[PDB]
Amino acid sequence: ATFEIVNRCSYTVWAAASKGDAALDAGGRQLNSGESWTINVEPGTNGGKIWARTDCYFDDSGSGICKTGDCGGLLRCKRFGRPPTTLAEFSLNQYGKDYIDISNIKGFNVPMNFSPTTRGCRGVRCAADIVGQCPAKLKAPGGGCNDACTVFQTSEYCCTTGKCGPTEYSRFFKRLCPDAFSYVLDKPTTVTCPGSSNYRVTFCPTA
């Protein structure tokens, strides 16, 4: 499928696309305010993720660091990024259809809109100012708003026993962004799209 990753934020971010054990397309790229990055994610891609990284510093070899969403210090990500990271999640060509969602399970760093550029389904969005409203204990010193699992490492927040319920912290993310997963067992906000649909991920959609 084809994804256009657009940065509408007034400042540069560093986009990243990965399925965990490898990079999607180039994997990562610098995106200045207003720039667009088109990529082709191989069909059949399961567990793909697209996100933004903030305050990055890379040398000529694509090696460095970012304050949010850093992926092993590489410009071109081969792995998922370090929280907090608003996540555009998706799986393509699964039993004839695709499904997408936005997740705050790994925290929030930048507002986002994840929508299809073809027909057959609607998009999802989480454009509230979660960083600005972030509770003191979840505020990431490097910028962003950490999820409770990242901050406290408990079975409840991380839902490690496969059994957990909503929490005061997950409720913060759910209240500001109803259409995004607030915790692991959150009521699905997944959207089912026709197989092989195309999409556009927009950072700071309401800017």
Swiss-Prot record:
Intrachain S-S bonds: C9-C204, C56-C66, C71-C77, C121-C193, C126-C177, C134-C145, C149-C158, C159-C164
One Pfam family hit: Thaumatin
This protein's UniProt keywords: Cytoplasmic vesicle, Disulfide bond, Signal, Taste-modifying protein
Organism classification: Eukaryota, Viridiplantae, Streptophyta, Embryophyta, Tracheophyta
Compartments in which it is found: Cytoplasmic vesicle
One GO cellular component term: cytoplasmic vesicle
Organism in which the protein naturally occurs: Thaumatococcus daniellii (Katemfe)
Chief localisation class: cytoplasm
Family the entry assigns: Belongs to the thaumatin family.
Described function: Taste-modifying protein; intensely sweet-tasting. It is 100000 times sweeter than sucrose on a molar basis.
Keyword Signal: yes
InterPro entries with a match to the protein in the record: Osmotin/thaumatin-like_sf, Thaumatin, Thaumatin_CS
Keyword Cell inner membrane: no
Stated name of the protein: Thaumatin I
